């Protein structure tokens, strides 16, 4: 697309911000607020429409895990509710295959989901698919070659370095090589033929390390680390470069946005969000209006 959208997040409470960053000129635009505040959500784009999935409204008047699917139209700058998932999913992971949205894992209270469901925009309907072999919240999700990957997270007792892959035509999950680092709440995306896992929380400290999985070789290799440690970060890809937005570094809710150029293997600070926050949903699509 053209703009990097960030939706929701957490700072003192769950947020409703929707803001769009333009890597071409460095400008931020504040757009229509989410109907419901929510942190720990995921963002994605299908057919030029932005989607906000799952999360949790941490608020003074209580805390409510979200099963909501909400759709934003850049042309109209308006949100509309879509069909809700079968179960609330806080700290969700999302991926898109063949125009379908896969919702992966997440928590509902003290329940840690292994279940997975798929949304078909043409029918505005969710359907459960095979569950993961492992319960995962704070799970990273990415799509490569029409295969879905769930990486890391937290199963209710242990934080995970494990990862698994979903084969749609077989409706089957299979474990892949584990990461070299335990990561919960990492930013997971795809660039070229590799699944990147950036940052996260390994049980003791927030991470700045970044490793990538090559599907051909089935191995994980560390690349350059990020300038700032961070968990609960937003991540996306824009014109062959990785962007990581916000997160929590153990001391502050970051406004820092870093950019990874895989050819030079370097991270640089490219902008700051209008305010620090963690647990945002991120996606890339067209320019509003
Ligand atoms: O285990 C954790 O401490 C953890 C950290 C995170 F940043 C997110 Cl998003 N989720 C979880 Cl579950």
From Swiss-Prot:
Q: What is the effect of changing residue 91 to M?
A: Impaired interaction with NFE2L2/NRF2
Specify the effect of residue 159 to M.
Impaired interaction with NFE2L2/NRF2
UniProt keyword terms in alphabetical order: Cytoplasm, Kelch repeat, Nucleus, Repeat, S-nitrosylation, Thioether bond, Ubl conjugation, Ubl conjugation pathway
Q: Where in the cell is it found?
A: Cytoplasm; Nucleus
The annotated phenotype of a deletion mutant is:
Early postnatal lethality caused by abnormal cornification. Mice survive until weaning and probably die from malnutrition resulting from hyperkeratosis in the esophagus and forestomach that cause gastric obstruction. Defects are caused by constitutive activation Nfe2l2/Nrf2, leading to constitutive expression of phase 2 detoxifying enzymes. Mice lacking both Nfe2l2/Nrf2 and Keap1 reverse the hyperkeratosis phenotype and are healthy and viable in normal conditions.
Spell out the post-translational modification annotation for this entry.
Non-enzymatic covalent modifications of reactive cysteines by electrophile metabolites inactivate the BCR(KEAP1) complex. Accumulation of fumarate promotes the formation of cysteine S-succination (S-(2-succinyl)cysteine), leading to inactivate the BCR(KEAP1) complex and promote NFE2L2/NRF2 nuclear accumulation and activation. Nitric oxide-dependent 8-Nitro-cGMP formation promotes cysteine guanylation (S-cGMP-cysteine), leading to NFE2L2/NRF2 nuclear accumulation and activation. Degraded via a proteasomal-independent process during selective autophagy: interaction with phosphorylated SQSTM1/p62 sequesters KEAP1 in inclusion bodies, leading to its degradation.
Consequence of substituting residue 91 to A: Impaired interaction with SQSTM1/p62. Abolished interaction with SQSTM1/p62
Main subcellular localization, coarse class? cytoplasm
Per the record, what is the consequence of mutating residue 159 to A?
Answer: Does not affect interaction with SQSTM1/p62. Abolished interaction with SQSTM1/p62
Question: Which GO molecular function, any one, fits this protein according to its record?
Answer: RNA polymerase II-specific DNA-binding transcription factor binding
Q: Name one GO cellular component term.
A: inclusion body
* Modified positions (S-(2-succinyl)cysteine) in chain numbering: 289
Instruction: Cite the position(s) of the site with description Sensor for electrophilic agents.
Output: 110
Q: What does this protein do?
A: Substrate-specific adapter of a BCR (BTB-CUL3-RBX1) E3 ubiquitin ligase complex that regulates the response to oxidative stress by targeting NFE2L2/NRF2 for ubiquitination. KEAP1 acts as a key sensor of oxidative and electrophilic stress: in normal conditions, the BCR(KEAP1) complex mediates ubiquitination and degradation of NFE2L2/NRF2, a transcription factor regulating expression of many cytoprotective genes.
| The protein, known as | Kelch-like ECH-associated protein 1
Q: Which organism is it from?
A: Mus musculus (Mouse)
Name the encoding gene, please: Keap1
Q: Which residues of the full protein are shown?
A: 325 to 613 of 624
